[model samples]
Structures are given as structure tokens and as C-alpha cells.
Target: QVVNVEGIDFATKFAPPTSSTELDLIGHGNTGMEIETVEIRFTAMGFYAEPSISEHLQKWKGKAVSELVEDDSGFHKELIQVPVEKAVRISIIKGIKGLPYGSALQSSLRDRLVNDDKFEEEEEEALEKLVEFFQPHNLPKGANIIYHWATPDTVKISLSEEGKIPDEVSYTIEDANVAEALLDLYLGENTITPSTLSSVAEAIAA
Candidate 1:
């Protein structure tokens, strides 16, 4: 049985330019079993916005926050001043599946953030974590992420610094304790495809 995850929800919490200002993505899984808690932090590499707007927002950066209000226009509007910092934090709250793979468990860290004009500038990491949770069949060049529950409680994972070649073998993890990590720092943008929870369920016969 492919241990498939279902009822997945991706949500974001934003903190504008301030002392501890941050962008947080929290993920929840409805069913299936494995990892319950996961986290990925992205620190801003660079800042982007309308040059003038950047300056205006920067003035409030680290000091002010965006105000949300219900307009007579029937739409919600943000009062502007948002986080001017370039970094982010991703937290997966709940469960990390414990298989007996070779690699040991490690804590999470903040590396770099991507400025793709798509993910509210903060929602990026959460989306990336969501994709990793599924552990797709076809992945990028350097990383080869796999799942074990397809066979049940037993999970296997293989890792090599270089995953591009066909026979450059080095490390292998089996029936291992699998944890979720972010990939946006490695992949460009738009990696979050339509391969969602429903599709994953069909794959696992969930």
C-alpha cells in the first residue's frame, strides 16, 4: 500500500519588515501516515518591487505592518507596509514518519528565499513543502525524493550528491525515517503542479 497523504491544506502567515518579521507556511494532512512536522526557512536573497514602492515599503520595513480592512467596495485591502526583509520560514506542524532508513534525523534550517512574483512573496515555501510531501515520481536533477509506504510502513530512499547520472551510486536509505524538506531554493519556480492530494490518493489506492 502506498502510504498516501490526503486532506492537505497549505496556508501562510506573513510578518512585514520588523524585528522578527517573517513569512510562515503551515501544512496539514488529513489522512495517511508518515511525517507530521516539517519546516523549511528561506531568507531573502534579494528584494524586488516597484523602485519607488520598494522605498516606500522599505521605510515601513521592520517597523510597520500591513493593515487589512473590509472596504465598502466589498473587497479586502491591505494598508501597505509589509516585510522588507528577503527571508522566509516554513514550518510543517505534526508528525515525521519514523522508518528505519540509513540516514539519521536532522533539524530544519533557513537557507535562501526565492522572489517569484507568484507566492505572495511568503507563500512560496509552503507550496514547495506541499510538493515535497507527495514525493513525485519525476523530480529535478540533483535530488531524487522517494516514498516507502507504497509498500507499507517500509520506506526506502536513495541519495547521491549527483543524481543526474545513471550509475553514480553512493548512498542508500531504506525503511528509513523520512522527513520533508523544501526545494524552491533549488528549483526555479512553478514546480507546484496539479499533482495534488486527490491525484496522489489514486496513485496509492487510498
Candidate 2:
């Protein structure tokens, strides 16, 4: 099944099987801004994880959605730390320069890493490579970016044009801290997209 999030469509089940891995979409939402009287949508995002995530989260299986969404709840933290195959699908809703887009992510990831005392020299180098990878391209509307946690300590990023398939593996980040920080940006307490995290919590509760 598919669902519409801020006008962008996301598959309820995202099984983009790699050579030795797969994942399922658990929730989705979008990022937007209100400028003056205009509502500008930026990107629609989908959160995917291995089926085993359900097993890992069984402790909260019967909890209420409100319970999971509570600020003191450690559900989101557990969601991030669970060693499962996870991926985030971000589809551009508005055009954005690759450099600025990449830089935005870099700043967010850096802050999270720093807070956890994980932003060392190695993590810095990994982030630089990510920004460099996006320094030349233009991410127009409909472009898709996938951040796949290929391993516990590695992440593989892929980019596809407006209508192309996302088969190109652009960059591979090999820092464990970078991997965790990237996930934190979307699923952490201060998520860039609160709606996404809330929806994931609700879905899990359901």
C-alpha cells in the first residue's frame, strides 16, 4: 500500500532489497515551513527498519501511542540504538541546491555527535566526505535520497534524479558515530521532522 504525505507518495512497505539485506517501512511524514501565508513543503520522509524491530520493541507492544510520544519515554532512543537494518527515504518536494542540503544535514549530524561526545577527527572526516559528495549536484523536486544503514558501523547513501531509479551508491560513510548521528537527526528527541517520529511511535503502538 501507499500513503500520501504532504502530496508525496510513500510505499507502506519499502523492501529495497540489497544483495544481503532488506527493510520494511514503519512510518512516514513530511517537513514543511510556513512563510507568510504560504505553506512550503520541503521533503517527504519514510522510516524503514528490519522486521525484527517489532520483536525488539515487544516490551512496549501494548503501550498507548500517547505513552510512546511522551517526552520522558525512551522509545525513540531504543528505536535508534536497536541493531537492525534501517533506512530513511527522503523525497524532495521543493528544489534545493545539493551543497546547502548536504550542509544542513552535516550541521544537524554534527550537533548530535558532539552532544554524545562522538564527534572526533574520524567523524569529522566522514561528514566532510558527505558534504563533498553533494557539492556538485542539484536536487530538484522528485529527487530521492536514501540513507541506508548497511551495517551497524556503516551507512551507504544513494541519490536518484527526478524520475530515475535509486540504484547508484554514491558514498559510503564508515564511521559508527556518523551512522548513529544520522539516525538521531530523524528519530532522536530533537528530530528535524517531529511528525515523522510521532507517526513512527503511533505505528509501533498500533
Candidate 3:
């Protein structure tokens, strides 16, 4: 965002170079607030501004969790063991009403904002540990997790009856812990494109 001005030509102004988070987008209350800002955006192999930025998600949309990503490997774990390999999205869910917003089994995303440097250091390790932990968790055939907002009370991961992944077997995470891991990886900035932008764009675009 830039408040365009040249010399004394200050008559015209541009959008403010301001970004927001949940604090900036607190809703009417009760329904819950949104993480107004996307952790990152995917654009032509790089990050870009809003309205910017894949595949492997279409075939699974509107389909049941089991149908989105088919596991032909029979081994099952081979399904989600591999990352999207393409673009994806992830979010820093806060004030989610009823769900535990902590990723990696501890800490809230809000902490990342207040203590980014510290949170990042811990997140780096947490991400590695998560991927390491899931290394052996076999993905059940027909397993999938769809896009849905995290709510208070019970944690329910929805599966898309009609979303798709590139491989013969499409896999999406339905586990909160896994999503948190993704969130961690997203904020960690290890990938060319962050997960939040990829997720919103891909999940909707997919």
C-alpha cells in the first residue's frame, strides 16, 4: 500500500500501507472474528499483494473425505505423506470461538505476532518435529479434510466431497494438529509460497 504523492502533488492519495490481523477485523462478536490477514500469498513462484495467486484440489470438492484423495498405493501412508508439491494455503486462526487455536500441540498464533522472533524459532523446530511425527502415520484410503472455519466447542474437520490433488491419490489434512503444523510451516517461511494464501486461493479455486 502506498499513499502516492509526487512533490507538492499531494492532492491524490493512495491506499494506506496498512495491513491487518484479527485485531483489525473483529466482527460483531459471538460469531467470532476472522484472521483478516493472509499469512502469505502465492504468485508465479513468489509472494505478492492481495488479489494475487493452483490445482490438486478440484477433484476433491463436494466429495466425501474418503473420495477427495484416493489412495491407490494401498500402503495408505503414501497418500498425505507427501506435501502438496504445488500451491496451498494456511491460516493463523485466533479467537475461533471454541477450538484450540494452538498449532503443534502448544501456543496460540496470537503469540506469533507479539513474539514473532521467538515464536518463529520454536515454530521451525515444531514444523520439523510435526513432519517427522506424521512420517509414519499412514493416511487411510479415501481420507480427506475439507475447508471449513474452526469453531468453538467441538473440533470438526470437514472433508470436501469434491476437491482434488495432483497424484492419483489426493490427500488433505483433516486433523487440527496437522493444520497447525501447516500453519507453523506457513509462518516459518520455508516454502517459496506460504500456506495461508495458497490455501484460501487453492481451496476456493480448487
Candidate 4:
């Protein structure tokens, strides 16, 4: 469901930039707004992946990690550094985390990450659709992201290159966080309205 990692009791046990959310709290303007990235590692339980990403953020900490680069072109992945109104693709791993541990964060509490029993079906569809999305541009470069959108539920995604992904994608939206990537795009000082469907329509309208 919605687990605010920073609000957990365990968060206080760590240091100041404790558990890694300080970047969000610190406002990018002052810290120069860094972009973060990860290789989408694993959880050994055979359950959901990174079952404790919120708890184990130490493994994924820091905005603008020097390693998020795509071609080693000296550029970081957009998730950590958006310029303002640019476009990007992000797969929030919490939902992905739920694939393995939709039960509890630190202990033994069991619960579905979302109310929908249909998430599994949707996630399946998303897997197929993502392959479709990647086939176009990525195929040309012969590149692979090394990540899979494993949220028990997944929304369809489309490329923001020429047009947009569609309403179908939004209806699938329990959440959409490609915003970090969008922020990294354009790199101008524009603001964001990640919640606005109208805005999504305007920019990527099909």
C-alpha cells in the first residue's frame, strides 16, 4: 500500500540523512537537485524484490549518484536529476518490492500492497507492454535497462519520445513516478504538476 519509509520507527535509529530521504526533505534548489539511479538489485526470499527498500535505502541512497550513467557519457540517470519540464521513464520499485514482500516491511505482518486482486493480471499485461515499448528505441541501440517493473500490478508504459503512452496507462496508475525522469529532461527551471492528467495529456497527447 503506502508505506512512508521515513515515517517508520526504524528511521530514527539511523543517521541524519537517515535512511536516505533527506534529499527529498532538503529541497533540490539548495542541494543542486541531484538525480539518483539503481540497478534494481534483489531480495533473496524468492518473495518480492528488495522487500525492505524503504528500510535498506542505504543500498540505494544518494541523488545524482555518479554511477547512474547510461553510456558513461558523464550523465546520470534522470531519476536523480531532472532539469524541470523534461521527460523520463521511472519504475517505482516499492510496488516492485511488493512483488516479493507485499506482506510487511521489517517484520511479519501480511497484507496486500493494494486493494486490487486484479493487480496480478495488470502486472502481467504491463510486462508485455513494457517489452513493446522498449522494442522500438532500445532495440536500435541494442540496450537493456537491467530492471523489470515488478509491482504485483503494473501500468502500461509508452515512449514519451514522439507521442505519449495513453489513458490506458493512467487508468493503470496506482502511481506514476516517471516524474524524476521528466524533471531531468529539458533541465529548465519549470515546475511540475505530476498529478495532473490534463498536463500529461497536453505534453504526450496521442
Task: Report the alpha-carbon TM-score of model 2 versus the true structure.
Answer: 0.91
lDDT of 3 at 178: 38
Worst 10 residues of 4 by lDDT: 23-32
State the C-alpha lDDT per candidate. 0.24, 0.83, 0.27, 0.23
Model 3 lDDT tens row, 15-38: 111212111110010102224664
TM-score comparison, 2 vs 3, better candidate? 2
Candidate 1 runs further than 4 Å off: 1-141, 165-195, 201-206
- Candidate 4, residue 155: the lDDT equals 27
Candidate 2 lDDT over 21-97, as tens digits, reads 66778889888755598988899999988888888888888798778867879997898888888889999888888
Off by over 4 Å in 4: 1-119, 136-206
Per-candidate TM equals 0.20, 0.91, 0.21, 0.19
How many residue pairs clash in each candidate at the backbone level?
24, 0, 26, 17
Candidate 2 positional error at 81, Å: 1.4
The best candidate by lDDT is 2
Q: Residue 68 of candidate 1: its Cα lDDT?
A: 10
Clashing pairs in 2: none
lDDT of 4 by residue, 1-206 (tens): 22132221111121111122111111111001122754332211000122232232333344233232223322223223322111122222222222222112211110121322423554444434433444334211111111112332222223222222222232122323332222222121222222221222122211
